Design a protein around this nucleic acid. Structure first.
Ligand code: SAM
Length: 335
RNA sequence: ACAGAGAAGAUUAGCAUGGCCCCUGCACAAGGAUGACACUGCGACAUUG
């Protein structure tokens, strides 16, 4: 009402589906536990908790800055019957953006939509069409810097996300992420007519989501992409026959732990045992007996292909080494 | 009714650069080969909004 007064945007729905895919692609053996969310900037609409409840039955905590917006969020949830699922908090301009858990479990994800102006003169200079809601010191980069700074002290929250409305933002915030050595992040490019958006999610945990969620197809921001998670190959009929035997001999001759999972073949590596360094260190008397770096990935076969999708790890060297070894394994059998 | 095109110049053919798999090697470096790759450079061109 104060700033939105329109339900036409489906970007809220797509942001929530991105949350769902980012969680369901990174859950694993973990049970379907109660999931609680955080909406920094719940606003007088609180669309994010509402559609994260009506769509996947999550729980939510909404942190607001404005008295009117806090009251309106309370009313909205009161006539929505998620009183027992969602909570709302009013905070002053100086409070930390991440509220205390207050005895419950730590949030599974934090998700925001930072304010995106700096001055009222700049408001008018760019677009003050007739309308501290849209004002902050630094913009969507300064707010993201605050969130990044406070995300050192709450690492239990798995998936931190932030939404950016200017392409120039992605360089700065991704540069700060690389300064703080957050390897597991991602950019998701949206599309609404001509408008584009950038969901720069970042986590401090091992689970890596799908490529379609961290690496956008367009190579415009190719310098800012996270590491690769999936490396696909194309097969030919003799390999499309001997694929099972070749994968067996590869994964068994290299001292590589593995086990099958129905229609998907798995792996569980606690040390690189396929690199040349692995066999040299095993064959040379040295104090270290393992090249560190965990990994979980799945090798599946679909229609003359082979996929190596990463599903765990803090280190990209292990994934790249396994991918290259597998590619050579295909090559030394196709011919 | 209020957050990427509204622009730097880009992308790309390409030439370098960098790791990765392979071989050689005790290590580091060092070297070849190859071909699955970029969070690195410069653009013989080619065309755009
Ligand atoms: C673009 S609005 C996000 C509104 C969101 N799209 C919604 O569902 O209404 C930016 C938000 O930043 C929040 N915000 C700004 N500074 C804050 C602070 N210090 N503490 C809490 N929230 C803050 C405001 O409450 C505001 O809702």
């Amino acid at each position: 009402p104060e700033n939105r007064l329109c339900p036409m945007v489906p970007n809220r729905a797509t942001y929530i589906r991105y949350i769902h895919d980012l969680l369901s692609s990174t859950s694993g053996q973990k049970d379907k536990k109660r999931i609680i969310g955080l909406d920094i900037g719940t606003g007088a609409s609180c669309i994010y908790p509402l559609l994260g409840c009506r769509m996947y039955s999550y729980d939510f905590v909404g942190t607001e800055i404005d008295k009117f917006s806090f009251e309106t969020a309370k009313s909205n949830i009161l006539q929505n019957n998620m009183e027992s699922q969602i909570k709302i908090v009013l905070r002053s301009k100086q409070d930390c953006l991440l509220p205390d858990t207050e005895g419950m479990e730590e949030f599974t994800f934090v998700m925001c939509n930072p304010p995106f102006y700096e001055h009222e003169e700049d408001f008018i200079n760019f677009k003050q069409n007739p309308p501290h809601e849209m004002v902050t010191e630094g913009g969507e980069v300064g707010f993201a810097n605050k969130i990044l700074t406070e995300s050192k002290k709450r690492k239990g929250i798995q998936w931190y996300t932030c939404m950016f409305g200017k392409k120039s933002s992605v360089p700065a915030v991704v540069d700060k992420l690389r300064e703080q050595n957050i390897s597991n992040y991602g950019i998701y490019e949206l599309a609404l007519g001509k408008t584009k958006r950038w969901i720069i999610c970042w986590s401090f945990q091992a689970m890596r989501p799908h490529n379609e969620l961290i690496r956008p197809s367009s190579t415009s921001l190719s310098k800012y992409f996270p590491h690769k998670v999936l490396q696909n190959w194309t097969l030919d009929p003799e390999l499309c026959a001997q694929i099972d035997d070749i994968l067996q001999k590869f994964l068994d001759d290299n001292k590589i732990p593995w086990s099958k999972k129905g229609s998907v073949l798995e792996i569980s590596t606690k040390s690189i045992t396929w690199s040349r360094k692995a066999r040299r260190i095993s064959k040379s008397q040295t104090s270290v007996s393992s090249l560190e770096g965990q990994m979980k990935c799945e090798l599946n076969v679909i229609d003359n292909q082979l996929q190596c999708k990463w599903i765990e790890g803090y280190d990209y060297n292990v994934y790249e080494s396994f991918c290259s070894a597998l590619a050579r394994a295909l090559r030394d059998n196709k011919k």
